[PDB]
Write a structure and sequence with these properties.
Structural class of chain E: mainly alpha
CATH class of chain C: Alpha Beta
CATH class of chain E: Alpha Beta
Family (chain C): Belongs to the universal ribosomal protein uS10 family.
Largest sheet of chain E: none
Distance between the termini of chain E: 27 Å
Largest sheet of chain C: 4 strands, antiparallel
Radius of gyration of chain E: 15 Å
Oligomer: part of a larger assembly
Number of helices of chain E: 5
Main location (chain C): cytoplasm
Strand content of chain C: 25-35%
Number of strands of chain E: 0
Order of helices and strands of chain C: EHEEEEHE
Modified residues (N6-acetyllysine) (chain C): 18, 59
Chains: A little secondary structure (74), B mainly alpha (97), C alpha+beta (101), D alpha+beta (55), E mainly alpha (121)
CATH superfamily of chain E: Ribosomal protein L30/S12
Organism (chain C): Homo sapiens (Human)
CATH superfamily of chain C: Ribosomal protein S10
Number of helices of chain C: 2
Number of domains of chain E: 1
Order of helices and strands of chain E: HHHHH
Strand order of the largest sheet of chain C: 2-5-1-6
Number of strands of chain C: 6
CATH topology of chain C: Alpha-Beta Plaits
Distance between the termini of chain C: 7 Å
CATH architecture of chain C: 2-Layer Sandwich
Helix content of chain E: 40-55%
CATH topology of chain E: 60s Ribosomal Protein L30, Chain: A
Strand content of chain E: under 5%
Protein name (chain C): Small ribosomal subunit protein uS10
Structural class of chain C: alpha+beta
CATH architecture of chain E: 2-Layer Sandwich
């Protein structure tokens, strides 16, 4: 009988905290400064989601999680 | 723990309409023998019951893998003080005397 | 059909036999012909369990027995007679299953 | 998310699906005839259930 | 003793806080705004940024909601009460929202009526 000896790797880890900005500069912008503004995201034509569902952007496969929709040309 | 507050007010409505109850330890299951079909997830409801009866002011009694509870009038006063619902709404349990 | 069966099941012979005799007497008071009791082989519910809660000592086992006796009696009578003879303040343990078939 | 993990491969011999109905003991279960106890608990209550030492 | 916007606004905010809900985080607030599920929203701007003010005022005009300009939100934050847990605790509030019905669903009040009849005229 001995110990478990979970000691060789990772003696201490620091928590992963997201530097989420309180100001919507990276998230949304108007670039117009007017009452009527344009939106920098593609209109979703799917009717399995809501009418206010806006997707973000990555290098590909805009990862919504709920639907896993990826734009492909068939 | 890891308990929401809408589930908290739902379980407080359940305690107000129920009062005296018997419980069975069931957490990991998706289907309970006698406390399912409440349109609310079972795990959080049972942890809500755990909070109610282990906050440190209402005593418990566990044997034969079951929970029988003696809801003290201190609990009645606590619920009245927090949720501010007058006790003039008598519980429906006082029929068939 | 007027054929009715009564299954009396209990763990002891005394109460079961007394109930069977009383039921047969009540049926026989009426000018009714009734089939004699049939005795099932009394299936035995053996359970063997180690005596010691720990795993120490000589290997000793409790042999627990639960003996279930069951009897069937056949007769021909309408439902009212059966349900009037049933409510006779039966002694505890003699479970009754009355069937029409 | 939750449904992405649960119910992936059926556990058709789940040992943890049973426990002693009196003290919640994992070992020595008595499932015969539906007692579903650790054998110690059964010995504690065997005379009350109806099981008796005759032989 | 007095009747005004703040006196009942503190109570409505505290009731909204107590009955859980509340749009929290950067998401589910703008989404709730753009889905038009609610008919009220209280937003504050005490720092140096006019672009956000202009954007939310344009959105309020789009939703035909008249912006209410209140001074010294610290007055609300100190009159509403911030007892919270134990003897310490002072979490401020900047955003005021109330899902399903604007006043509340637990009580019936004429504060909603006077607010709406002041808004229409």
């Amino acid at each position: 009988k001995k110990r478990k000896k979970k000691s060789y790797t990772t003696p201490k880890k620091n928590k992963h905290k997201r530097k989420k900005v309180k100001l919507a500069v990276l998230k949304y912008y108007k670039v117009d400064e007017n009452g009527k503004i344009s939106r920098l995201r593609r209109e979703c034509p799917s009717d399995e989601c809501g009418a206010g569902v806006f997707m973000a952007s990555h290098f590909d496969r805009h990862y919504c999680g709920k639907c896993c929709l990826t734009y492909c040309f068939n | 723990m890891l308990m929401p507050k809408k589930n908290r007010i739902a379980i407080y409505e359940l305690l107000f309409k129920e009062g005296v109850m018997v419980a069975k330890k069931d957490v990991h299951m998706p289907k309970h023998p006698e406390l399912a079909d409440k349109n609310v997830p079972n795990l959080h409801v049972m942890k809500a019951m755990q909070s109610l009866k282990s906050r440190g002011y209402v005593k418990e009694q566990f044997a034969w893998r079951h929970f029988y509870w003696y809801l003290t009038n201190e609990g009645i006063q606590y619920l009245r003080d927090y949720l501010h619902l007058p006790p003039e709404i008598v519980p429906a349990t006082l029929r068939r005397s | 059909i007027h054929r009715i069966r009564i299954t009396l099941t209990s763990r002891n012979v005394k109460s079961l036999e007394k109930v069977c005799a009383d039921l047969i007497r009540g049926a026989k008071e009426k000018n009714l012909k009734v089939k004699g009791p049939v005795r099932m082989p009394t299936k035995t519910l053996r359970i063997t369990t180690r005596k010691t809660p720990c795993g120490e000592g000589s290997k000793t086992w409790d042999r627990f027995q639960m003996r279930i006796h069951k009897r069937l009696i056949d007769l021909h009578s309408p439902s009212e007679i059966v349900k009037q003879i049933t409510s006779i303040s039966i002694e505890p343990g003699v479970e009754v299953e009355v069937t029409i078939a | 998310g939750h449904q992405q993990l649960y119910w992936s491969h059926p556990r058709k011999f789940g040992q943890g699906s049973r426990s002693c109905r009196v003290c919640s003991n994992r070992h020595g279960l008595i499932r015969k005839y539906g007692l579903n106890m650790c054998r110690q608990c059964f010995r504690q209550y065997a005379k009350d259930i109806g099981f008796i030492k005759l032989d | 003793g007095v009747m005004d916007v703040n006196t009942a606004l503190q109570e409505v905010l505290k009731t909204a806080l107590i009955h859980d809900g509340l749009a929290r985080g950067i998401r589910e607030a703008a989404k709730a705004l753009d889905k038009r599920q609610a008919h009220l929203c209280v937003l504050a701007s005490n720092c140096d940024e006019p672009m956000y003010v202009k954007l939310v005022e344009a959105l309020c005009a789009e939703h035909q909601i008249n912006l209410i300009k209140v001074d010294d939100n610290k007055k609300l934050g100190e009159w509403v009460g911030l007892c919270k847990i134990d003897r310490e605790g002072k979490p401020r509030k900047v955003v005021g929202c109330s899902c399903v019905v604007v006043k509340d669903y637990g009580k019936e009040s004429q504060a909603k009526d006077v607010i709406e009849e002041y808004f229409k005229c």
